[PDB]
Design a binder for these strands. Structure first.
Ligand code: GTP
Ligand code: MG
Ligand code: MG
Ligand code: ZN
Lengths: 242, 145, 94, 47, 1111, 323
DNA sequence: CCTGCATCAGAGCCCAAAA
DNA sequence: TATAATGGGAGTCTGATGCAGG
RNA sequence: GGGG
């Protein structure tokens, strides 16, 4: 444990204490909190998020170029089953150069992702909804499209936020995600029990505007014995409709 | 006051962990020492073995500790050593010859195991699926000598 | 939302038990090439390609649909695990 | 067999020696010309 | 077009030279243009004078000189060289024993030179030195928090130039002194100064109980020498108290004008506060063999008088900008210079003992290595020496005027709390209250106010106009914070008739506190509203209408504006955008009067009155640090008559000399089908068609070919097993041809490296034998193109060893650089913002036929959701749009100064005049009011927008004066059911662009010890799935998903190899195995002599190493 | 109707809501921030009051403390007054005004932000914590003065620095909570305990020195989704032992209490659960995200730590009291 | 017995991170 | 492998807990 | 130093 007792041992001509066995095990950068309770992972990606009003609640926009990398092993197997490449090794060689990618390969990827979901995460992950599952819809373009109703649970804006993508690999992972983690199956807060995916911003704005009623000042509460008198009074332009 | 609707249900879970531990006032007829701190569960478990052995049971006191101290005291030394105060936790554990039974989540996360929650709980873990065709097929051959 | 997800949560004592039955079932189908399915040819999930209609490759979709039919039996200690594997590989090869 | 438990305990000097494949006798690391490890040093392949 | 300027404020002085804080600081330190005999004792000169003469033998300092730079600025940037001058020093050696004198001029290495715009070139990269705010040296008195009626006097010198002192008065009644965190009774130190009980009684005594509490008899029972020995035993236990040793320790700590330096500001603050005069910068002296006090007794005197409540004694506020000073470039560099000089002296004294006490000159006695390293250490690695922000000219101008409270000699992040981050009342006119980072650094990093300048002592000063009687003079006085608090300062907008104060009641400040005062009481007046804010904040029009939290974002983001090929200045300016281009040095001006002889893409030649045919070459497509293109364009024609200071070429992000950070677009403020949701922005495809928001960007690629123990890396066109299709765009030598389109995977520079002892495995041997191709000696290491990058190859630089002028780092044969450019059209995910802090990403690009449009057929450019305005409270953008509407039809641009601006009525006059052109054209063209315009007018009178009972023209003009127009939806053709706000807004394209940020990985590089995926896009890293992410998966109970993250997708080696094989074979992924980073954990605990044992249910050991680690 | 249909309902509400907002004609021009006529009146009233408090100072009737305290109180009330004026003028004479529409519907905005647009900015704070006596009389529509702007900057910076130092304290807090509860999981259906807790429906009130009904949302937080420990009959309804309380069940219990039939509710709780290393289905109750009994195996401790930690960001005692 | 008083171990996440 | 040489140079703020002291 |  360096520095524990006495002057910390340093390399010559540096103030940096040398990193001892104790420093490796402990702390934020330590073995436990860096490589053991959390890790960097394969089959993941990240990009800028963009709003996607046209999506259904269970969907996300996924750039095709991102999807090709995340599913690359799947894409290689599928490219052999149909026929774009003789075998797995040659197929990978074709994706390496971007001009060597033909258009049939994009149709090949579409077959692969059918029914599978991906995970969206946005940091900070404050509660269990910082990660939700979405079925991806391939898009041209470099941006992730996020469904409007889920922005609240994620505390997402479009002021330049980015999100991370993860691919659950096994049949077991995919099942857990589609049943337990699907955005549409978590509609209520685990904290308060109240609705989480709910109208906000424009959605509220539109619905309030069409359901509000006019109240006009021209008539100003006159009495009329017969209703046919009233319509006549309005026809004179003495009394407003509402 | 800050306008946050939150169920008491959650705060009670945490407070329950704050009260997890007790301090011995008299051991009576046990190996414990006066002033020794231990989980309330373990001393309740011990006391029914003593009251069933007839010897005088252990006298204990409710003990309230904040979340940090409570977190550092759980039996699992992998949980405590991954939290904080890593050297202290680890030196006392190595002396005691402590065994982590891998009860909680963090222990299993560290080993890369399938956690004891969700699809990993022993309640749902072993559930089998079989189609009526296969259920009856296996069933007919075995109902005989 | 997954189709008929509410009815599926109805079938189980614990939502996580649903996930296991579905996940294990999808593994049975993939290993055996779908030929142990309890579904009938018009109930088979289909996938629209550029060529045209083919069988849905996703076995997890299949398993949930199969479950909804009622033709699957789920529980604990239904059959020794190894013996089940041999009887299934005997009825529907690999 | 399957891992059900993790124990941590003190190591005797005998046991510390029970692990060891050799004694590191020299502060040397690797040879400055060949770039291969120095015999009996910290990277020695014999150990 | 015409430029209409509002505002009544006459600014008596222009903004100071804006980069002067940099240029003037360093010029003063080097004094290179001053003849040595005329140098004042400051900066570099002062460092030499402080370190010399060096005692034993004596080495004495004569003078220094600075040479000229070996290479010019452009050349240095090219070759990864530092821009610097050779330094020499004339030294005379004296032998204190003999009489011998040998004198020689020794070479001390190089010193980096500052360019004209205030930046540096360090190893080829342009750098900035950020000024550091800190506590001024001096003597301060603060209240002791523990005892509510007692105080602590702290004597703080310049950083690293002495200890901190505390004079707490202890509960026992005796006055205690604190040095290096150790305490003793202060009376003991007083006796060492030669003080007797009489002096302390007669001087102070007036405070009955305090002066007697300092008196201790045992201390008096000894002459000044014995008291010195007594104190030393307290400070250094175990060191024998030899009389020469004790004097040395105490002298170096207290009286030595080499080891203890109060500031020059410290001397002034001390002399002014205690009412004494200091003979030097030290707390005491060594004179006539004993010590003579200077500071200590006056500091003790002030403390007792303060505790007693004597008039004229106050506590000091330590965040006041009079007691807080700025350390500029010269001072920071000089501190590092002083350290490097003292280290070289260690070498001198040690060499004056070894090797013969005679045959030594000054040239052999001096080793310059310590000095060179200290200067190189400061510039290449200090945390105040930063990579220049040169995204656009304003980026670097702002960077140079920043003030940091962090760095070597200041707060840490973990070490910093509220008092320092606050906006102090004295920040008025000196440090900008707006421009600060949001997040952890709030209040620590700030920006110099526009009219502020840093004086010789390091205090920030701000200008005010003198007011005599009621008449305002034109004489301007720059004041420090301490001196400003004496007077009564009227606001800059107070009404004037001529030079006379025209109001009976004026708005003024006394010590920052706002007060209403009669014109008889007015001593000074603000120069301008501009003096209160930073340069970036001063670029925000209608700032008086914006909430501060949003104004901040406006300031900071202009720094991030990317230079656009079509860049334009905003239609509503503040009047500073002209000055910023000029002080930045991005553009180009005419030196004297003259006539333009020639104008080229590459150069402009001007013939002046002098007859000289000065040639100005133009910088074309140079790549800045952030990859935005800095390029200058000619603005004059052959034969054009120019006067002195007229524009010749426009720099990047400038248009006819005004700062152009963006484009002026026609905007509609209205929701659009949820593409507007939560700040996203919808834009018209017309913008890409006409190349608005297109910017050029260059990325730099580099590769070295070096000597290895296995043989040379060679850069060649011959690369094993590659088709001619792959090599087509490569020249003869293996370098890509200039003017080729390269896309991801393409080879930029071909290179071969000799194969390791992995000399092909027998598996490869048999395969190679089948095809009858010898396994080649070299493998293909060619430099290629990263995922997602690429463009057109615009340049190549190749540098070998054995070519004139070039020597690489040892072992390196050759270095090749390829510069690749791309034209970036605006796309979905690129980020836009205006100057008021509305910022959002482009979520939708609609074809022009879908865009909402005016009745006369003109489609709008941008659709911004109104839901962004009310919570944000940034209304300047709204007023900006209205004045922008008038300007669209009248064909004009405006200057509306901050806080003295266009006001609502004046904008209304302008808006009415526009309506005539928007409508009168129509009435004459033979068209009447539209059917749909009536339907909207119907809806508008229900809203109270128009007055009922007027002609449609009368009502439409009523809406047009509220800045609203009728808008037709291009999808339906039907009107929007209400009038919509439409006008011209200035919007910038910021530096965050999806092309740079999109990243994904299947599998890739792993870390050495942990075997987990690397981080970051450039390494093809995996995403970090951290502690909180695991919690997310845990709370859902998704165990198999989580286990995948912890094993197959990270460091489980057997599992991840096996999992990939399964996916490409169509099998399901296997159940995971033990993660490798746990095995590392186990072995690391064994290195700590702890036995970690994995056990089964039977309590038997389980081997997770599968036999590999057991004998 | 359940989740599947609610997903469809949400998407439908999403679809039409967006479409109507576009054609509605909602915009914001500067004239949409309407200075109420009542403002000038309320300002004239405030100046005569302030002058009267000055007479009581230089004549020695009131102290410096008393004078400053009285000034702040006067300006607080004038602020409240002007807000009501803004919202009354909107409702009566301009009910479809864009600012008004956004605030009232909950699309964006709150009364205090709108007051700064059309009203006065109000009182600003000194660098310490004490408030300036002089307010900012301008609104963002009228525009401020450099001096008003500068006085206001102090509070902005203090708010920004407070928030920055709080997220770290909240972040740390959450990590403690996960670590103390992480092992807690729902491990069985019923532990069998006979113990429970009594949720009070009435809090002893200091002002009446007796009893008043606890507030609605508070009771909902203590009651919704809990299993009843004992049978409860109120208003002729039998709430059985073992029944999960529906939100409707809770509203019924509140109504019975308003009628004096029931003062507290016996309920199963995790405090009293006897399950080792976690809780059981009954003492937990509803899985609040599915509005139905929790499934065995749900990692409940983690959800408790996340539910408590997530709000930490937005808390103004404040968060220090929670820690 | 009790209280000052020191020595120690804590201080949010993810991404660029321009070496 | 030989005049004689003999004692060093250098840098915040919080809460919890185990310790010499009126 | 910069993004949320
Ligand atoms: N934890 C953390 N979150 C950050 C950080 N920087 C930015 N954020 C995110 O920034 C977001 C701020 O969103 P706001 O736009 O202020 O959300 P709001 O409450 O709707 O405020 P308005 O949009 O003005 O109405 C939060 O959701 C944070 O998650 C950071 O450094 N740490
Ligand atoms: Mg955001
Ligand atoms: Mg927001
Ligand atoms: Zn229970």
């Amino acid at each position: 444990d360096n520095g524990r007792r006495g002057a910390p041992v340093t390399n010559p001509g540096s103030d940096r204490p040398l990193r001892s066995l104790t420093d490796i095990l402990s702390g934020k950068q330590g073995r436990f909190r860096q490589n053991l309770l959390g890790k960097r992972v394969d089959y993941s990606g990240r990009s800028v998020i963009v709003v996607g009003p046209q999506l259904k609640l269970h969907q996300c926009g996924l750039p095709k170029r991102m999807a090709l990398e995340l599913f690359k092993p799947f894409l290689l197997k599928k490219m052999e089953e149909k026929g774009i490449a003789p075998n797995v090794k040659a197929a990978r060689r074709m994706l390496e150069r971007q001009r060597d990618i033909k258009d049939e390969v994009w149709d090949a990827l579409e077959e692969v992702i059918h029914g599978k979901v991906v995970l969206l995460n946005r940091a900070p992950t404050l509660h269990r909804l910082g990660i939700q599952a979405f079925q991806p819809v391939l898009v041209e373009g470099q941006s992730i499209q996020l469904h409007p109703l889920v922005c609240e649970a994620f505390n997402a804006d479009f002021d330049g936020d980015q999100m991370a993508v993860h691919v659950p690999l096994s049949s077991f992972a995919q099942a857990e995600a589609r049943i337990q983690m699907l955005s549409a199956h978590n509609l209520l807060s685990p904290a308060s029990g109240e609705p989480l995916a709910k109208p906000s911003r424009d959605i509220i704005l539109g619905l309030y505007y069409i359901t509000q009623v006019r109240k006009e000042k021209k008539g100003a509460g006159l009495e009329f014995a017969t209703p046919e008198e009233a319509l006549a009074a309005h026809e004179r332009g003495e009394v407003a409709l509402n | 006051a800050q306008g946050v609707k939150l169920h008491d249900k959650h705060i009670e879970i945490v407070v329950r962990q704050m009260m997890k531990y007790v301090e011995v006032t008299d051991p009576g007829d046990s190996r414990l020492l006066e002033g020794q701190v231990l989980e309330k569960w373990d001393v309740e478990a011990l006391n029914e073995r003593l009251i069933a052995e007839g010897k005088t049971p252990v006298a204990w006191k409710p003990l309230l500790m904040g979340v940090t101290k409570s977190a550092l005291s759980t039996k699992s030394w992998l949980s405590a050593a991954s939290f904080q105060n890593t050297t202290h936790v680890l030196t006392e554990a190595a002396i005691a010859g402590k065994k982590d039974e891998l009860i909680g989540l963090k222990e299993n996360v560290i080993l890369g195991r399938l956690i004891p929650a969700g699809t990993g709980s022993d309640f749902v873990r072993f559930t089998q699926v079989v189609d009526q065709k296969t259920l009856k097929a296996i069933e007919e051959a075995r109902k005989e000598a | 939302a997954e189709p008929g997800i509410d009815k599926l949560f109805g079938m189980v004592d614990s939502k996580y038990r649903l996930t296991v039955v579905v996940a294990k079932r999808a593994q049975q189908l993939l290993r055996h090439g779908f030929k142990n399915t309890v579904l009938e040819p018009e109930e088979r999930p289909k996938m629209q390609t550029l060529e045209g209609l083919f069988d849905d490759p996703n076995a997890v979709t299949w398993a949930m649909k199969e479950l909804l039919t009622g033709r699957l039996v789920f529980g604990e200690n239904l059959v020794p695990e190894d013996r089940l594997q041999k009887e299934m590989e005997r009825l529907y090869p690999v | 067999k399957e891992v059900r438990k993790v124990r941590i305990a003190l190591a005797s000097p005998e046991k510390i020696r029970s692990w060891s494949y050799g004694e590191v006798e020299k502060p040397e690391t690797i040879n400055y010309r060949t770039l291969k490890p120095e015999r009996d040093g910290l990277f020695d392949e014999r150990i | 077009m015409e430029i209409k300027r509002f505002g009544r404020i006459r600014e008596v002085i222009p903004l100071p030279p804006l980069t002067e804080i940099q240029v003037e600081s360093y010029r003063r330190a080097l004094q290179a243009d001053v003849p040595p005999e005329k140098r004042e004792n400051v900066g570099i000169q002062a460092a030499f004078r402080e370190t010399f003469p060096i005692e034993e033998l004596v080495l004495d300092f004569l003078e220094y000189r600075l040479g000229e730079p070996p290479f010019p600025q452009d050349e240095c940037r090219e070759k990864d060289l530092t821009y610097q001058a050779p330094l020499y020093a004339r030294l005379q050696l004296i032998h204190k024993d003999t009489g011998l004198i040998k004198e020689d001029e020794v070479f001390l290495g190089h010193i980096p030179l500052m360019t004209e715009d205030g930046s540096f070139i360090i190893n080829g990269a342009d750098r900035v030195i950020v000024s550091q705010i800190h506590r001024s040296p001096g003597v301060y008195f603060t209240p002791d928090p523990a005892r509510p009626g007692r105080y602590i006097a702290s004597i703080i010198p310049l950083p690293k130039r002495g200890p901190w002192i505390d004079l707490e008065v202890e509960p026992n009644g005796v006055v205690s002194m604190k040095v290096n965190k150790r305490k003793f009774p202060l009376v003991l130190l007083l006796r060492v100064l030669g003080y007797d009980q009489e002096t302390l009684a007669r001087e102070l005594g007036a405070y009955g109980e305090l002066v007697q509490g300092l008196m201790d008899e045992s201390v008096f029972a000894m002459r000044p020498e014995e008291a010195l020995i007594r104190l030393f035993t307290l400070l250094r236990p175990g060191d024998p108290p030899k009389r020469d040793k004790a004097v040395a320790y105490v002298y170096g700590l207290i009286a030595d004008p080499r080891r203890y330096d109060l500031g020059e500001a410290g001397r002034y603050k001390a002399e002014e506060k205690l009412g004494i005069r200091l003979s030097g910068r030290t707390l005491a002296r060594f004179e006539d063999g004993e010590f003579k006090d200077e500071v200590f007794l006056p500091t003790l005197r002030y403390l007792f008088a303060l505790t007693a409540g004597v008039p004229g004694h106050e506590v000091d506020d330590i965040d006041h900008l009079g007691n807080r000073r700025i350390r500029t470039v010269g001072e920071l560099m000089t501190d590092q210079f002083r350290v490097g000089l003292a280290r070289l002296a260690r070498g001198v004294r040690e060499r004056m003992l070894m090797g013969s006490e005679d045959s030594l000159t000054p040239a052999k006695l001096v080793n310059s290595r310590p000095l060179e390293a200290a200067i190189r250490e400061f510039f290449s690695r200090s945390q105040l020496s930063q990579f220049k922000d040169e995204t656009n000219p304003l980026s670097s101008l702002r960077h140079k005027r920043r003030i940091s409270a962090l760095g070597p000699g200041g707060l840490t992040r973990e070490r910093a709390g509220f008092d320092v981050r606050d906006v102090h009342r004295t920040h008025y006119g000196r440090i900008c209250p707006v421009e600060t980072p949001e997040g952890a650094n709030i209040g620590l990093i700030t920006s110099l106010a526009a009219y502020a300048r840093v004086d010789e002592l390091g205090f920030i000063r701000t200008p005010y106009r003198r007011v005599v009687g009621g008449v305002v003079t034109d004489e301007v006085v720059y004041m420090t914070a301490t001196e400003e608090d004496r007077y009564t300062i009227a606001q800059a907008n107070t009404p004037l008739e001529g030079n006379r104060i025209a109001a009976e009641r004026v708005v003024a400040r006394r010590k920052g506190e706002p007060v209403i005062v009669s014109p008889e009481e007015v001593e000074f007046m603000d120069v301008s509203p501009k003096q209160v804010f930073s340069v970036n904040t001063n670029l925000i029009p209608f700032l008086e209408h914006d909430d501060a939290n949003r104004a901040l974002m406006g300031s900071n983001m202009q720094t991030q504006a990317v230079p656009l090929i079509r860049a334009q200045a905003p239609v509503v300016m503040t009047g500073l955008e002209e000055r910023v281009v000029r002080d930045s040095l991005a553009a180009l001006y005419a030196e004297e009067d003259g006539e333009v002889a020639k104008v080229d893409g590459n150069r402009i030649v001007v013939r002046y009155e002098d007859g000289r045919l000065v040639e100005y070459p133009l910088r074309r497509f140079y790549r800045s640090n952030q990859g935005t293109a800095l390029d200058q364009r000619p603005r004059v024609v052959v034969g054009q008559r120019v006067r002195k200071g007229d524009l010749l070429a426009d720099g990047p992000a400038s248009e006819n000399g005004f700062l152009a950070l963006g484009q002026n677009v026609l905007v509609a403020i209205m929701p659009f089908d949820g593409y507007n949701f939560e700040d996203a922005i919808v834009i018209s495809e017309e913008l890409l068609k006409r190349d608005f928001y297109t910017s050029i960007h260059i990325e730099r690629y580099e590769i070295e070919a070096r000597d290895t123990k296995l043989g040379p890396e060679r850069i060649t066109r011959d690369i094993p097993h590659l088709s001619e299709a792959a090599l087509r765009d490569l020249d003869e030598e293996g370098v890509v041809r200039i003017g080729a389109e390269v896309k991801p995977g393409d080879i930029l520079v071909g290179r071969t490296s000799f194969k390791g002892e992995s000399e092909p495995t027998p598996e490869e041997r048999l395969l190679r034998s089948i095809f009858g191709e010898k396994a080649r000696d070299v493998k293909d290491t060619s430099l290629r193109v990263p995922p997602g990058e690429g463009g057109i190859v615009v340049r190549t630089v190749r540098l070998r060893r054995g070519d004139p002028g070039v020597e690489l780092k040892p072992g390196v044969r050759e270095v090749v650089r390829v510069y690749v450019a791309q034209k970036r059209k605006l796309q979905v995910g690129d980020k836009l913002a205006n100057r008021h802090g509305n910022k959002g990403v482009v979520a939708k690009i609609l074809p022009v036929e879908d865009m909402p449009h005016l009745p006369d057929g003109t489609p709008v450019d941008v659709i911004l959701n109104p839901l962004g305005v009310p919570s944000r409270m940034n209304l300047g953008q709204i007023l900006e749009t209205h004045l922008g509407l008038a300007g669209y039809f009248l064909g004009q641009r405006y200057i509306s100064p901050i806080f003295d601006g266009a006001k609502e009525p004046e904008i209304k006059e302008l808006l009415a005049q526009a309506f005539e052109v928007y409508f009168g054209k129509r009435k004459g063209e033979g068209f009447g009011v539209d059917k749909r315009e009536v339907e909207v007018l119907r809806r508008a009178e229900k809203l109270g927008l128009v007055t009922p009972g007027k002609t449609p023209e009368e009502q439409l003009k009523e809406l047009f004066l509220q800045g609203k127009v009728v808008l037709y939806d291009g999808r339906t053709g039907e009107p929007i059911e209400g009038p919509i706000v439409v006008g011209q807004m200035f919007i910038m394209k910021l530096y965050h662009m999806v092309e740079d940020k999109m990243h994904a990985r299947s599998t890739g590089p792993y870390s050495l010890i942990t075997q987990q995926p690397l981080g970051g896009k450039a390494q093809f890293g995996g995403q970090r799935f951290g502690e909180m992410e695991v919690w997310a998966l845990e709370a859902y109970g998704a165990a198999h998903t989580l286990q995948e993250m912890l094993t197959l997708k990270s460091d489980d080696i057997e599992g991840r190899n096996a999992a990939y094989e399964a996916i490409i074979k169509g099998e399901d992924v296997p159940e995971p195995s033990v993660p490798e980073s746990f095995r590392v954990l186990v072995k690391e605990l064994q290195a700590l002599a702890l036995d970690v044992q994995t056990l089964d249910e039977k309590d038997n050991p389980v081997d997770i190493f599968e036999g590999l680690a057991s004998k | 109707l359940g989740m599947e249909k609610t997903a469809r309902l949400l998407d439908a509400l999403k679809y039409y809501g967006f479409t109507f907002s576009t054609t509605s004609g909602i915009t914001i021009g500067i004239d949409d921030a309407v200075i109420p006529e009542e403002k000038k009146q309320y300002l004239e009233e405030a100046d005569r009051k302030l002058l009267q408090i000055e007479q009581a100072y230089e004549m020695g009737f009131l102290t410096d403390r008393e004078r400053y305290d009285q000034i702040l109180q006067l300006w607080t009330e004038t602020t409240e007054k002007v807000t009501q004026a803004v919202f009354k003028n909107f409702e009566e004479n301009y009910p479809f005004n864009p600012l008004y529409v956004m605030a009232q519907s909950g699309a964006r905005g709150n009364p205090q932000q709108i007051r700064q647009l059309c009203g006065l900015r109000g009182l600003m704070q000194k660098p310490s914590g004490e408030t300036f006596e002089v307010p900012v009389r301008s609104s963002f529509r009228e525009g401020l003065t450099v001096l008003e702007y500068f006085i206001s900057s102090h509070g902005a910076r203090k708010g920004g620095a407070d928030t920055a130092l709080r997220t770290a304290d909240s972040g740390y807090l959450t990590r403690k909570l996960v670590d103390v509860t992480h092992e807690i999981v729902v491990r069985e259906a019923d532990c069998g305990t006979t113990n429970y807790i009594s949720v009070p429906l009435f809090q002893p009130d200091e002002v009446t020195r007796s009893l008043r009904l606890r507030k609605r949302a508070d009771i909902e937080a203590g009651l919704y989704g809990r299993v009843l420990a004992r049978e409860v009959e109120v208003l002729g309804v039998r709430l059985e032992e073992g029944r999960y309380l529906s939100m409707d069940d809770v509203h019924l219990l509140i109504k019975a209490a308003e009628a004096g039939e029931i003062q507290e509710v016996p309920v199963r709780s995790p405090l009293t659960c006897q399950t080792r290393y976690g809780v059981c289905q009954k003492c937990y109750g509803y899985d609040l995200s599915m509005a139905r009994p929790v499934s065995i195996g749900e990692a409940v401790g983690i959800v408790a730590a996340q539910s408590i930690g997530e709000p930490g960001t937005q808390l103004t005692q404040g968060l220090p009291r929670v820690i």
